[PDB]
Design a protein around this ligand. Structure first.
Ligand SMILES: CN1Cc2cc(Br)ccc2NC1=O
Length: 127
């Protein structure tokens, strides 16, 4: 109860589609970032209990993580690529809001975002 419920990874009343762009976001973007040596702190929701970050969910009100994103991609949750991109950007942004430059966790996010940006540069033209 110090942690909130995690973000949903399915929602039967949400509209969704499959696109070449969403497939690329799973195949290339998520899987590449997932395997990165700095991936591990972002592979699941921030556990404020285990990590003794009792202020986290007082500061971060739209939590996101790659475990959630991966599940959303696997579960065909998204209407378009933009929705998924927004979730990665929320993940990064949260990290940069809560922490400060030079913190380890920030170096990790930055390195992951740098790669994310590289991969999003080659996002295929839709259809
Ligand atoms: C995204 N994270 C996860 C994390 C893992 C460890 Br270990 C220590 C601090 C944090 N804080 C974050 O912002």
């Amino acid at each position: 109860s110090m942690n909130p419920p995690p973000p949903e990874t399915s929602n039967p009343n949400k509209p969704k589609r499959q696109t070449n762009q969403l497939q690329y976001l799973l195949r290339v973007v998520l899987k590449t970032l997932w395997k990165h040596q700095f991936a591990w702190p972002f592979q699941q929701p921030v556990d404020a209990v285990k990590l003794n970050l009792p202020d986290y969910y007082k500061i971060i009100k739209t939590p996101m993580d790659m475990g959630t994103i991966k599940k959303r991609l696997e579960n065909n949750y998204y209407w378009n690529a933009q929705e998924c991109i927004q979730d990665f950007n929320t993940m990064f942004t949260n990290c940069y809001i809560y922490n400060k430059p030079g913190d380890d966790i920030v170096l990790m996010a930055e390195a992951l975002e740098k790669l994310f940006l590289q991969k999003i540069n080659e996002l295929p033209t839709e259809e």
